[PDB]
From Swiss-Prot, chain A:
Predominant location category: secreted
Keywords: Disulfide bond, Glycoprotein, Pyrrolidone carboxylic acid, Secreted, Signal
Residues carrying a glycan: 46
An example Gene Ontology biological process: protein-containing complex assembly
GO MF annotation, one: immunoglobulin receptor binding
Name of this chain's protein: Immunoglobulin J chain
Function description: Serves to link two monomer units of either IgM or IgA. In the case of IgM, the J chain-joined dimer is a nucleating unit for the IgM pentamer, and in the case of IgA it induces dimers and/or larger polymers. It also helps to bind these immunoglobulins to secretory component.
Source organism phylogeny: Eukaryota, Metazoa, Chordata, Craniata, Vertebrata
Organism listed in the record: Homo sapiens (Human)
Disulfide bonds: 10-92, 69-89, 100-125
Record's subunit section: Part of the secretory IgA (sIgA) complex that consists of two, four or five IgA monomers, and two additional non-Ig polypeptides, namely the JCHAIN and the secretory component (the proteolytic product of PIGR). Part of the secretory IgM (sIgM) complex that consists of five IgM monomers, and two additional non-Ig polypeptides, namely the JCHAIN and the secretory component (the proteolytic product of PIGR). JCHAIN-containing IgM interacts (via CH4 domain) with FCRM (via Ig-like domain).
Curated annotation (Swiss-Prot), chain C:
Residues listed as glycosylation sites in the UniProt record: 65, 72, 157, 378, 426, 456
UniProt effect for mutating residue 31 to S: Disrupts the interaction with pentameric IgM
Residue stretches making up the Ig-like V-type domain: 1-102, 120-194, 207-309, 321-415, 419-508
Coiled-coil boundaries: none
Disulfide bridges in this chain: 22-92, 38-46, 127-182, 214-282, 228-236, 328-398, 342-352, 439-491, 443-467, 453-460
Name of the molecule in the record: Secretory component
Compartments where located: Secreted
Description of how the protein assembles with itself and partners: Either free or part of the secretory IgA (sIgA) complex that consists of two, four or five IgA monomers, and two additional non-Ig polypeptides, namely the JCHAIN and the secretory component (the proteolytic product of PIGR). Free secretory component interacts with bacterial antigens toxA of C.difficile and eaeA of E.coli.
Extracellular side: 1-509
From Swiss-Prot, chain D:
Primary gene name: IGHA1
One term under GO cellular component: plasma membrane
Subunit organization: Immunoglobulins are composed of two identical heavy chains and two identical light chains; disulfide-linked. Monomeric or polymeric. Part of the secretory IgA (sIgA) complex that consists of two, four or five IgA monomers, and two additional non-Ig polypeptides, namely the JCHAIN and the secretory component (the proteolytic product of PIGR).
Residues of the full protein shown: 125 to 332 of 398
Native source organism of the sequence: Homo sapiens
Functional summary from the UniProt entry: Constant region of immunoglobulin heavy chains. Immunoglobulins, also known as antibodies, are membrane-bound or secreted glycoproteins produced by B lymphocytes. In the recognition phase of humoral immunity, the membrane-bound immunoglobulins serve as receptors which, upon binding of a specific antigen, trigger the clonal expansion and differentiation of B lymphocytes into immunoglobulins-secreting plasma cells. Secreted immunoglobulins mediate the effector phase of humoral immunity, which results in the elimination of bound antigens.
Record-annotated disulphide pairs: 23-70, 116-177
Top-level taxonomic group: Eukaryota
This protein's name: Immunoglobulin heavy constant alpha 1
Length: 128, 223, 509, 209, 215, 206
């Protein structure tokens, strides 16, 4: 009954909304704005680099959660035009479940120093 | 007698890809023996047919020479003074893109319960030319249903940027029900040449917020 | 919603085995992440009982295994040697036990002449009797609340269905699930258990298609079958019928296939929406509705919103005389198939007749104006239809020949307007002396590539062709016009791989 | 030779006590008569000359809708030119909505944009002023569009924009839009916003640990 | 007079390129798929000179699952001796756990001891490497135990531990140490875990503009 | 023909009774012919041969060197092996490390670790107790005594892991690692952990 406005996975915020429209009395309606921040509390600052300090300040601007970095198609009077619905289009507070985060480290192996590539989130990082 | 060379209109360069360059010649007393010549005319033919005074001449074309940027010159000659006038145009560099903002109704109008006013402000763009279309749902409204002002220059002592507003008055039960209204702003400095903001009653100014902060240590995946 | 789906309620008797299948979106994370079977007990907290990373509990050691099929996109839990301590609430899921991505299963086992039949079939109750009861009232009795009432003179509740020794009862209502006594001075007891149908789990995608295989018996094949959908309460929304009904929502995307030698039809639904999920009930009652005593059969659909089916134009528009180029997507890995294109002609009829296919057959009335292409490959094919009319407006289906079919429907609308390419009418060449055909095109297409193709059944391929770009004009010039240079030619625009508007002209010699 | 009768200016009729009328010509190549204090003649002002006849002190006769009529007789011909003007009474007062900044603009924290919108007034003439607290801003700080006509009676609209600093908005300074239209009895309608206005939202933070 | 087929070592399989199999007889050689080399006598205890044969370039044949058979002929018994070997297919992933110093070792300011537990992997070959921030520590600064087999909780799994002693002025000044475990069953051949002084509480969640337009 | 005198094992030295030095001689051929000169049990039991001196638990903790001479007819002179109790001894430093938090998130079993570090003789005995009941040795895994890297003195280390049910941890009972060694006077250092060994957020909304 509550539609979903945002489902951000870089900062893990999930704004939903629902008009509870009182048919009894005419202009006392209740729009709701449930927000569901999850604070990772164990993650680094540069999350793709495990040498950074712990993240201790989490700043959530709603204009930067809600943004749409995806183009759209609009029918303008005969045509289909493509549009850029953004105006602002970063640091990430959580990893994404469906995304592969690696980090290159310098292991030695004998007479060389090979830049091998580890996997910070395994099971999202398998090749197919 | 002077000579001006105007730019392609934005409605036609953007939705239609026509870059018809107009060359007007104003300051004529009697003569209909004007003559135009276009130096990057690789075949296309100008027109004539002067009203009352001025003489116009439109060189046709498509947007691919104009968007690539080319120097079009309208060398005009008349039988009043034997030197010819010249004029040159190209696509203007130093462009900024608009910052489209779509503003909800004021609460005065929603409590009056009759018709509410959605405002579209586009701001900070460098050429004077912009297109503001409006949509309801996804059906484009007819242009006699909204007011759109001109593109004036906003005050700053630095760069020269412009701004335009647009007003759509919709039904109060139509807003209060909850369908979406879009303002689409097209400008030649935008990457895909069009931006499109969309607002309804859910996507602006609630009357109850419930923030729910979930602290958890073993996190950092966002399932 | 979590996209995991399995049985909402499993049932078994003590001592037997249970197999629980849970479905997940087969993305590359779900297939390699950790699957669990936690028991949601009281007090808070799942307690993981078996996992896909090796852990088997102490209660479940030696009598369970969790096996995982990433190709199907599912995982199954086998539990042997149940008992009434296994009755509770459980969850099957993926990853960490507390983060969601689970389905709540509710497994309730129970304690170990009992007839067990299905809804709407028949029962023959064979009851013995004695030599000294060859005259009196042979009868059944029922016990409606510890009260012996006559049933069979027939009971007013059982009017028309029962017949006399043994008795036979047809079209069993669910409220005949009591216990009866056969009395010829003696008495025998007999317990009827009428089974609800267990819903088969259909786990489909958004914008995909479901085929309900609706196989009842051959005893019921001459009855008017139907497909209801159970709402939040009790009434069904009759979706299709074999009497002519169809829901208004399923217009252009339903299909009721004709029956078989044994009454086994199938109902195809395409373009699935978030609101199409729920319990669906095939049945066979003579009014086409759901009544008491109709041999139903159930599916439980889950429309997965985490779909990888590519989102497409669901409505194409084209002007009268113009053209339409549809992109139909298919599954990328089965790139060698035979691709089709279809139409729509009603529900009870359920007709989707073929227009064009990928092997070189085009229909009779669509010669010169239909073509199926292969570009762009790797999961899309283009279908170009021109010479439009107002009666080309309808719903068209993008069938293939593989096993993973998403029969993508698309609606063509015929709006008012004038086409973009301006070809002559139907030019008439002569023998030996040449022909020149033009094709003017607007300023929108001066970036695009232009062509003239000659149309065959196997797909038209380009040709000589001049392209005057100053005065916008694509000329066609046939040097020596023979009788072979006949048929339909097409001018059209094209941007690399994606095709655009076309227009057609016929050259008669 | 054409004739024109120009209405009183709105700022000199609202603020000041002098709303002079003006009769001007456009195309003479060579005096005036006011049928309703005399006039003050102007420069020759060639272009097709244009001499003027201003007329002071006729503000309150103009407010009562008495039909002014100018008649200029030049010796380029015989028939003198005539132009009339009255004050129309079909006036509607504005609806003046002052509108807050976008949420996107005060998260970037550089300059915010306040939008005034005067809507629905029937004669075209309007005046828009801005005030920060109580001090008027100069005319070069804001931008006022023209008084366009609405899609509908026949009503008009005008929007205005002011870009103030975000540190000037966030610490709580009010801003007012003053729309002055000749239908208002007080001659002005003022609307005000600051950071906390508009029946505020109930926020219900709840931390789950 | 026995014969064994030895798998390629794990560090050559993950770090390097070539993965060479070994066939050792204790008491000529034929291989089922590139020419191989024999070996010296290499005389072991109480005699039993051992010729061995190493076959190179077998990285993708081994990693696919081709079963290797080596057969050696020798003039004591007339028949050759065979040996077979394949990559195992069960292959569970290691769980890497980096454990902070004990609380009674920080309050002495000499050296603290960080522990690294890899647990629950099904082939018993694993690599443990230690990192100081991003510079790798040598092999002579830490101690890694063998890969032993856990008690049964279902399948057959293994476990390994490693230890690291760092100076307590490094642990208090706030740099990080990582444990890096490499296994066959892992996605990109290595996985990492990192710890510092803080993860072994004051956060400041600020939510600006909770009302206003979300679009 | 190689002779080695193996010490009494620590298990029989701290808990058992039959503290017995084992004198092993490998690599002989013919049949037999060995004399073992050290309550003596003249036992040989040849598969190589291994003679057992039992009953000498008390002279070992004195500190005198045990001299075993094994005589055999393959060569001429008998062989000799000497051994006594270690003198430069250090004591362990038991640390019973808590479970990691990802283990608690998965809700299956938790993993206690017991690290005994820095002791100078190699031989050590790890035992585990839940409450006060000793767990059987088929319930935990114990690695060996590996010498740890130091350019100071030669010190050894041992880890031992115990996986126990997370219902036991969340219910709340105690788990004890009991490390035994010869350089401890009370003979067994026992450490104990239970579940019970602030977040302070600031929501700064607008």
């Amino acid at each position: 009954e509550r539609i979903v406005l945002v489902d951000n996975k870089c900062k893990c915020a999930r704004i939903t909304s629902r008009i509870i429209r009182s048919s009894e009395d005419p202009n006392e309606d209740i729009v709701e704005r449930n927000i569901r921040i999850i604070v990772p509390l164990n993650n680094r600052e540069n999350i793709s680099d495990p040498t950074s300090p712990l993240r201790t300040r989490f700043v959530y601007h709603l204009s930067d959660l809600c943004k749409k970095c995806d183009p759209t198609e609009v029918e303008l009077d005969n045509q289909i035009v493509t549009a850029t619905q953004s105006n602002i289009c970063e640091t990430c507070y959580t990893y994404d479940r469906n995304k592969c985060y690696t980090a290159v480290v310098p292991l030695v192996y004998g007479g060389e120093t090979k830049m091998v590539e580890t996997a910070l989130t395994p099971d999202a990082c398998y090749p197919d | 007698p002077r000579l001006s060379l105007h730019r392609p209109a934005l409605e036609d360069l953007l939705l239609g890809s026509e870059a018809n360059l107009t060359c007007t010649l104003t300051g004529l007393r009697d003569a209909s023996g004007v003559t135009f010549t276009w130096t990057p005319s690789s075949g296309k033919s100008a027109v004539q047919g002067p009203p009352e005074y001025s003489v116009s001449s439109v060189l046709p074309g498509c947007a691919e020479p104009w968007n690539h940027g080319k120097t079009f010159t309208c060398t005009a000659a008349y039988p009043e003074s034997k030197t010819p006038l010249t004029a040159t145009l190209s696509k203007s560099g130093n462009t900024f893109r608009p910052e489209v903002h779509l503003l909800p109704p004021p609460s005065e109008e929603l409590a009056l319960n009759e018709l509410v006013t959605l405002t579209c402000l586009a701001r900070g763009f460098s050429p004077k030319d912009v297109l503001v279309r409006w949509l309801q749902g996804s059906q484009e409204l007819p242009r006699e249903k909204y007011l759109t002002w001109a593109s004036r220059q906003e005050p700053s002592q630095g760069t020269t940027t412009f701004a335009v507003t647009s007003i759509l008055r919709v039904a109060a039960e139509d807003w209060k029900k909850g369908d979406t209204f879009s303002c689409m702003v097209g400008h030649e400095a935008l990457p895909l040449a069009f931006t499109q903001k969309t607002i309804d009653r859910l996507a602006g100014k609630p009357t109850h917020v419930n923030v729910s902060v979930v602290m958890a240590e073993v996190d950092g995946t966002c399932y | 919603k979590s996209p995991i789906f399995g049985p909402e309620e499993v049932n078994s008797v003590e001592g037997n085995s249970v197999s629980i299948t849970c479905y997940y979106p087969p993305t590359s994370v779900n297939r390699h992440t950790r699957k669990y079977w936690c028991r949601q007990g009281a007090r808070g907290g799942c307690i993981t009982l078996i996992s896909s990373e090796g852990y088997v509990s102490s209660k479940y050691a030696g009598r369970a295994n969790l096996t995982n099929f990433p190709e199907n996109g599912t995982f199954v839990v086998n539990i042997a040697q149940l008992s009434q301590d296994d009755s509770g609430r459980y969850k099957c899921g993926l990853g960490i036990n507390s983060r969601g991505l689970s389905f709540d299963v509710s497994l309730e086992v129970s304690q170990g002449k009992v007839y067990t039949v299905d809804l709407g079939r028949t029962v023959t109750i064979n009851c013995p009797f004695k030599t000294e009861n060859a005259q009196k009232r042979k009868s059944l009795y029922k016990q409606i609340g510890l009260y012996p009432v006559l049933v069979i003179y027939v009971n007013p509740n059982y009017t028309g269905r029962i017949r006399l020794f043994s008795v036979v009862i047809n079209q069993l209502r669910l409220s005949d699930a009591g216990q009866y006594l056969c009395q010829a001075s003696n008495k025998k007891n007999a317990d009827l258990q009428v089974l609800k149908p267990e819903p088969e789990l259909v786990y489909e995608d958004l914008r995909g298609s479901v085929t309900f295989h609706c196989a009842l018996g051959p005893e019921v094949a001459n009855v008017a079958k139907f497909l209801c959908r159970q709402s939040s309460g009790e009434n069904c929304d009759v979706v299709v019928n074999t009497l002519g009904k169809r829901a208004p929502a399923f217009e252009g995307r339903i299909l009721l296939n004709p029956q078989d030698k044994d009454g086994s039809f199938s109902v195809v639904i395409t373009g699935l929406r978030k609101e199409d999920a729920g319990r669906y009930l095939c049945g066979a009652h003579s009014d086409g509705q759901l009544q008491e005593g109709s041999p139903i059969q159930a599916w439980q659909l889950f429309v997965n919103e985490e779909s990888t089916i590519p989102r497409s134009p669901t409505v194409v528009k084209g002007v009268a005389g113009g053209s339409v180029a549809v992109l139909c997507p298919y599954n990328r890995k089965e790139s060698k198939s035979i691709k089709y294109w279809c139409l729509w002609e009603g529900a009870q009829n359920g007709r989707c007749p073929l227009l064009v296919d990928s092997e070189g057959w085009v229909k009779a009335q669509y010669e010169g104006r239909l073509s199926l292409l292969e570009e762009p490959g790797n999961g899309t094919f283009t279908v170009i239809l021109n010479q439009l009319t107002s009666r080309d407006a309808g719903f068209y289906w993008c069938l293939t020949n593989g096993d993973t079919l998403w029969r993508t429907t698309v609606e063509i609308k015929i709006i008012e307007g004038e086409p973009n390419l301006k070809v002559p009418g139907n030019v008439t060449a002569v023998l030996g002396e040449t022909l020149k055909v033009p094709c003017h095109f607007p300023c929108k297409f001066s970036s695009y590539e232009k062509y003239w193709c000659k149309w065959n059944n196997t797909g038209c391929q380009a040709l000589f062709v001049n392209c005057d770009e100053n005065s916008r004009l694509v000329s066609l010039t046939l040097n020596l016009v023979t009788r072979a240079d006949e048929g339909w030619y097409w001018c059209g625009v094209k941007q690399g791989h994606f095709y655009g508007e076309t227009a057609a002209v016929y050259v008669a010699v």
